[PDB]
Structure 1
Amino acid sequence: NLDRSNDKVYENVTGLVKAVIEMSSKIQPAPPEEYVPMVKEVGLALRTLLATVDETIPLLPASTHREIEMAQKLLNSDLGELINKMKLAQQYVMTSLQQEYKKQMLTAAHALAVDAKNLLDVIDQARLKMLGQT
C-alpha cells in the first residue's frame, strides 16, 4: 500500500538495517553460495576496465602497446584462477577443505588488485610520455 517516495522514516530504517548488515557481513565469513555474485561483480568491473584500456591504447606511443597488452592478459588470467578457486570452494562447502579454498580465493583476488594497480602504473607512465614530461 503506502507510498515511500518521501517517507524519511522508511528511508532511515532501511539505512540503519543496511549498516547493521554491512557490519555483520564484515565481521563474519560469507557462505560460499553468497560469493558467486561477489565474484561476478569483480568480473564486471574488470571487463569494464579492459574495455576502457582497449580504447586508450591507440593514443599512447606504440613503444608501450605491448607492455600494456601483457598487463591486460595477466588480469584476465587472474580472474581465471579466481573463478577456479571459487568453484572449488563451493564444491567443498562444509568439509574440512573449505577453509583452504577460501584462502586460495583471497590470494587470487588479491593478486588481481595488485596487477590492476600495476596496469594503472604502466598506463600512467605511457601517459606521462605522450604528454611530454621531463
Structure 2
Amino acid sequence: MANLDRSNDKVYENVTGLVKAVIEMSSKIQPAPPEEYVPMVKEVGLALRTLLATVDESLPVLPASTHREIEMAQKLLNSDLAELINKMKLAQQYVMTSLQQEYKKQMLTAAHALAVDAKNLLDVIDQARLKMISQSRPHSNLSELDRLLLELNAVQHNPPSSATRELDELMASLSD
C-alpha cells in the first residue's frame, strides 16, 4: 500500500513549483527583456497543461468527496491558461513599441489568481484526505507558499524604487 506514492506527491509538488515561478517572474516582470518574455510564457503554459495531467491522476489519490470541484477545476484551468497566454502574448508584441510595462501589469494580476487557484485546488481537497485520517483508521511547505504569495501582491503594488484542443492549438501559436 505504498507503491502509488509517486504520482500522489507529483501533483502536490507541481502545484508548488509552478507557484515559485509565478512569483519569480512577477519580480523581474518589469525588466523582463524580449528574450526572456518568449520563454516566460512557456513556463507558465507548462504549469496549466501539467496541472490538468497531475490533477487527473490525483483524482484517485484523494478520497471521493471533492470530485465535483475537481472536475469543474479541470475546465476552469484551461480558461486560465488562454487568459494568461493571451495577456503575456500581448506584452510580447507591445514591447517594441512602448507599452511594455503597461501590458506587464495586467499579466501580474491574472498570474496572481493563477498561483492561488493552482494552490487552492490541492488546499481544498486537503480537507478531505485529513477528514478521513483525523477520525478513524489512519492507515515545499504550505506556509512557505503563503509568505511568498504575499510578496507577489506587493510586487505588483509598486516597484522596488475543447480543453485538450485549445492546449494543442496554443502550442502551435506559441511555437511559431
The interval holding the TM-score normalised by the smaller chain is 0.5 to 0.7
Task: Tell me: CA distance 1:80–1:130, structure 2 relative to 1, closer, same or farther (3 Å).
Answer: farther
Distance 2:34 2:16 in 1: 26
- Measured against aligned partners, the alpha-carbon deviations of 1:31-86 in whole angstroms (never above 9, x if no partner) come to 23421212211222333332121112134444320112223333222221110011
Distance 2:8 2:112 in 1: 41
Name which of 90, 93, 96 aligns with 2:95: 93
49-58 or 24-33, which moves further after superposition?
24-33
- Measured against aligned partners, the alpha-carbon deviations of 1:62-116 in whole angstroms (never above 9, x if no partner) come to 4320112223333222221110011111221133422221111111111110111
29-38 or 107-116, which moves further after superposition?
29-38
Q: Percent of pairs identical after alignment?
A: 95
Task: Tell me: CA distance 1:131–1:87, structure 2 relative to 1, closer, same or farther (3 Å).
Answer: same
1:116 aligns with 2:118: yes
Give unmatched runs, 5+ long, in structure 1.
Answer: none
3-state SS of paired residue (1:28): coil
The TM-score normalised by the length of structure 2 is 0.53
Give unmatched runs, 5+ long, in structure 2.
Answer: 136-176
Task: Tell me: CA distance 1:14–1:95, structure 2 relative to 1, closer, same or farther (3 Å).
Answer: same
2:22, 2:44 within 8 Å by CA — same for their partners in 1?
no
26-35 or 120-129, which moves further after superposition?
26-35
Higher-Rg structure is 1
2:16, 2:119 within 8 Å by CA — same for their partners in 1?
no
1:88, 1:101 within 8 Å by CA — same for their partners in 2?
yes
1:74, 1:115 within 8 Å by CA — same for their partners in 2?
no
Backbone CA RMSD of aligned residues = 11.5
Distance 2:119 2:21 in 1: 29
